[PDB]
Symmetry: C3
Subunit: 329 residues, 3 copies
Amino acid sequence: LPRVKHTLVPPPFAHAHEQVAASGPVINEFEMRIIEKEVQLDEDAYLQAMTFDGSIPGPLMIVHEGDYVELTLINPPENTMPHNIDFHAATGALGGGGLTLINPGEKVVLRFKATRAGAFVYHCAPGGPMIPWHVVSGMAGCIMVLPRDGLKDHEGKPVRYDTVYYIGESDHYIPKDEDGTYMRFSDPSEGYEDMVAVMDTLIPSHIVFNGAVGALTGEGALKAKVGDNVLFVHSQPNRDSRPHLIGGHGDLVWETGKFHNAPERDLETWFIRGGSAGAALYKFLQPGVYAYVNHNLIEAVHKGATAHVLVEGEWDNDLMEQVVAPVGL
Amino acid sequence: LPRVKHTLVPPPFAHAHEQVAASGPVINEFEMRIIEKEVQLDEDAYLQAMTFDGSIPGPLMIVHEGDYVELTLINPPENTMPHNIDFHAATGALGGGGLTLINPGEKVVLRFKATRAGAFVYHCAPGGPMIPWHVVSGMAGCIMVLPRDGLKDHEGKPVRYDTVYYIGESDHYIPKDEDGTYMRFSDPSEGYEDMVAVMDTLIPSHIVFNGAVGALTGEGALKAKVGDNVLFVHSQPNRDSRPHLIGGHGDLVWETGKFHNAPERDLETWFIRGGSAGAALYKFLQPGVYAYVNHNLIEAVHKGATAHVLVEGEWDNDLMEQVVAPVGL
Amino acid sequence: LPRVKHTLVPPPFAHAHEQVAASGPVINEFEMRIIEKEVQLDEDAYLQAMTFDGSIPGPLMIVHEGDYVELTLINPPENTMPHNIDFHAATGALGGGGLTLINPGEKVVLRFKATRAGAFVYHCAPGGPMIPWHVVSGMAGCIMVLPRDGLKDHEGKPVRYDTVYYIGESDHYIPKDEDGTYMRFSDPSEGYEDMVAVMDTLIPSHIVFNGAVGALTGEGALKAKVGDNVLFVHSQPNRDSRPHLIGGHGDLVWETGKFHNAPERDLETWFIRGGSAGAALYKFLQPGVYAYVNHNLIEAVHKGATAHVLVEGEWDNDLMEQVVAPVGL
Ligand SMILES: O=N[O-]
Ligand SMILES: O=N[O-]
Ligand SMILES: O=N[O-]
Ligand SMILES: O=N[O-]
Ligand SMILES: O=N[O-]
Ligand SMILES: O=N[O-]
Ligand SMILES: [Cu+2]
Ligand SMILES: [Cu+2]
Ligand SMILES: [Cu+2]
Ligand SMILES: [Cu+2]
Ligand SMILES: [Cu+2]
Ligand SMILES: [Cu+2]
């Protein structure tokens, strides 16, 4: 088999790829470096993060069904924790968790066959209580396994996207000092017991896209043009989400994320099961600002789960028109 | 195009309509008036509500796929807030939110084309933090866009309902005084900061059908007869629900709510994604009292999410029979 | 019609049955005894349980679509509560609830026709507030109604399992003494008011498989061999779950649980709606330890929702291989 090396791009973007496989099965080589660091979630709020390649989420990997994935995972010596990786895309050894546990200052190389098409979470899962703590510290990402013959719709005809954005949603449990302010810590372990108490309540303090409140707004706002077919791949490794495109729809949605399943059409809001990634296509019809949200609007607005899409193009009054502008009674 | 004016009926009922379109595409004219008022949720519990037409939920609008909807929205001068409307049925301008923001004492007229069949939430969404607050104050409703050729089942054959009921479920976050009693306020704004703290916990104090605990029980109990095919359209603008008909089933269920998708059959309980409306048909087989619930039974019973259906007709012992009555051991 | 008597086996196992019906419609006789008892949920944590046959969940009953089910339900005189049973599999009388309410020291015999294929919750539901309390005390179980002609896949071809395990997930609301320790009580009623306060927060203290933390680990660990097609039937009577097989997938999944619906394939995680039971088949490919979890990993690890599967067989390096073992940088 040919081998193909890849250079990962941080989310929400995607490394280069073909939808329809150019070749026969290949071996896909990726490398990631584990990075522990405090990140800023919001104006007043920080997280002792544990990341794949410095990002929340970890970067998107793309391959085709029946390729192999061979990943060099590196845990640099300044890190304080063992770490590993579980690919939900993979068969055996706890998704690879059982074969990839590395200490600060080790590497490991795992190969699995991508026997199943879909977008799949991958996350760290060291063992027992370390499993939820590491995930809720940001250590999760997504791999997308495209059918060899590109995407097909509900009746088997090819559909093609012009753009893919990877939206990684994550819940976090930032504990608070006696004064009601979020706590800062020097390292993750110092934060461990107080994070646990928050985690036990199952109420996230933040729920964010691409690692921070507003990360996908302002300078981070996603971009498209009328007529673009955009694929929105959305992961949530630990808790449910109900993605909605305000002003738009899901044209084709695989909310359970697996491309050989029939997608649903015309959805207003769909459902991402915690522990999973889903995918929705939408072809933009109208220019202007859109917002992509978790539709528990408390989660979208008070917790952080809002992204913006800026869309240029010609407006169509047939689809919508302000007939009479805001006027006195 | 012909224009058709409609007189809205408050939920759970529906204004008059045809399932199969009588005509070609038409323009559907609706008008609603925004009403802010304290409503009573339960014996000891009140809400500073913000409503479309005085009801929680806002009334059901019905049209056919490819019609237009032209809505006059009015915000009377005694109201204290700007308000707007986002139709999830609509394409562009944040579902119409961006073109319908009106101050107390203004109106606006929005037209959109109903290009997509299904039941869809519509809700107020003024901007930022006002978005979740206004929704959780009751400002949401549903529009149903029926395929031109009526409803079809999993294999494309026509199915027809004899009755539709619109069940609008809403979560609310009523804050409490120091003594553990729910607070009352003079206006919504006075309640804003204390409601926010409750909202941040993501735990609703109430979760109600048609605006109040027991609203669809007693005098409000829904009604049918053995042999009636009833469509139960169920909205939840902000939080998930898991509707179940006790004693019954969903014969055909579009839990994501969009009629061109294949429905599922024989369901015991289905799932309404927060931010969405779904629909289930059931043809009654047995007379007697049924309960329609959110099947987190804590939500159904402690929070308010229970409705009753009273069904008359002949009992069938073949389906169920008490073989031996309650007798001593 | 023939009558067939059954001897129930406690979960996670299943009484003997045929997948494809041996005979024409029959009458299935079952008997269960209600048992109230304190059970141990975790090292430091007990529940005033109310059970069908002494187990959480109550045992799995299996029949074929169009059979009848005739159940003798017995409430022994040492119990302190009335109790009843609602089969979600059943049509009329609140799933049988309305015809089966028995006092301590009575029995009742209910017959219903199993007109609908799928796995269905059955639970106690005495009336009003007793409904959620009795369920969250463990009184729920599952009945599985197999199509007469066995299971079929997405395109109608027969699929056959070698093993079925019934995984019953339950949320519990164990209140705590002033010192932060879980309370013990002498009887359920003594615990009623303090459990209620916990229930009102909607945050479970425990969320367990087969009635206790670790119940399906260690000596309880599920077992299979490479090449076994295992059916995992998973119930949750009151709250949602997101089952995931770590190291595996759902080959065919009916997450809403009803076998005449098309299953989805290749799922990483699926969704069990509170108030329902779902089913997933998986044919093991790799030997070793797997974990079956609720993929809110806080729920899986901090709350109790983890089971283990121990699988023997030959390892396949084509599916996965540790290319380079854990080595220094
Ligand atoms: O396949 N997107 O360039
Ligand atoms: O319609 N977006 O909340
Ligand atoms: O279409 N119901 O009268
Ligand atoms: O079966 N109704 O809770
Ligand atoms: O049908 N399992 O022996
Ligand atoms: O991939 N199991 O958390
Ligand atoms: Cu880690
Ligand atoms: Cu996982
Ligand atoms: Cu408003
Ligand atoms: Cu919305
Ligand atoms: Cu009971
Ligand atoms: Cu039930």
